[PDB]
Amino acid sequence: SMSTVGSAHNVRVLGSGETTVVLGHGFGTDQSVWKQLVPYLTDEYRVLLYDNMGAGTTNPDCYDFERYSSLEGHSNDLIAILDDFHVTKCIYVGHSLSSMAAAVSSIFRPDLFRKVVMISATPRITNTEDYYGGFEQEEINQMNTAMEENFKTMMMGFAPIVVGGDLESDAIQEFSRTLFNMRPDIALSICRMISGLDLRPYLGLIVVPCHIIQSSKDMLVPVAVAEYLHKNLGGKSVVELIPTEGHLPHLSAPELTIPVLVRHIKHDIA
Ligand SMILES: [Mg+2]
């Protein structure tokens, strides 16, 4: 059979070309979240897709609770994936968590990345005296408390609120399907990690060009966070807001988001 890293992350390679586009997904989804975007890319790029460890499509026994208590475990998985599949200078396009993992990875291994397109990314969701992440700490702890109380109940509100729109919409139904296929203890572990994550000290060390993409109204990512990322990244960057509501605009608003991503994949920051 194929490599252990490839089978553990369900790595899939489509198309062909000189440049490889790598697609990463966020919490509660898997690589199937990119099914609408991939046809726009396979004729000119090689496209690699992979699942984060912990996704409902991955083996629950491979989720080392110690290893994935910080982003480093996901960052080292990504490096191993691109190594095992011999990718260099890829165009990385990732939603939320995965784009941050790629950005940090580029600090130590800049050979693997030509640029990073971050969608709805944030270095820290909790406010401090000098930083606005969107949530006071005594809101996040109350959140973390409620997720340990009734996790499935919190996720049943989480999914439509975070995606935005009608309970009946296709995006909310699809996001719920993959979110509820996760194992509760694994998902809770991931939310704990995101909840305490603070990537602010890393931003100055990231020097690969970053394209900061997010919805103008994201319940988890204030527009101030995109501006904070732009300001504190160590290399070139650009910010473009998608005029829409939702944390997963690639899933909920493809008609706006897919044209934005293709233009940022193709064109470079001068
Ligand atoms: Mg993030």
Author numbering: 0 to 269
Q: What do the authors report?
A:
Therefore, our results suggested that ShHTL4, ShHTL7, and ShD14 were able to hydrolyze rac-GR24 and 5DS, but lacked KAR1 binding ability. Y150 was changed to F150 in a subgroup (ShHTL4, ShHTL5, and ShHTL7) of the divergent clade, thus losing the hydrogen bond between helices αD1 and αD3. Therefore, helices αD1 and αD2 of ShHTL4, ShHTL5, and ShHTL7 slid away from αD3, resulting in larger pockets with a reduced chance of causing steric hindrance with ligands. This finding is interesting because ShHTL4, ShHTL5, and ShHTL7 have been shown to be highly sensitive to various natural SLs (polyspecific receptors) in a previous study. ShHTL3 of the intermediate clade evolved from the ancestral HTL paralogs and developed the smallest binding pocket due to the presence of P136 and F190, which are proposed as the major structural bases for the ligand specificity of ShHTL331. It is suggested that the divergent clade ShHTLs lost the ability to bind to KAR due to bulky residue 219, and they developed a highly sensitive subgroup (ShHTL4, ShHTL5, and ShHTL7) for SL binding likely via the evolution of F150 and other pocket-composing residues (e.g., residue 194). ShMAX2 was also able to interact with ShHTL4 of the divergent clade in the presence of rac-GR24. ShHTL4–ShMAX2, ShHTL7–ShMAX2, and ShD14–ShMAX2 interactions were induced in a rac-GR24-dependent manner.
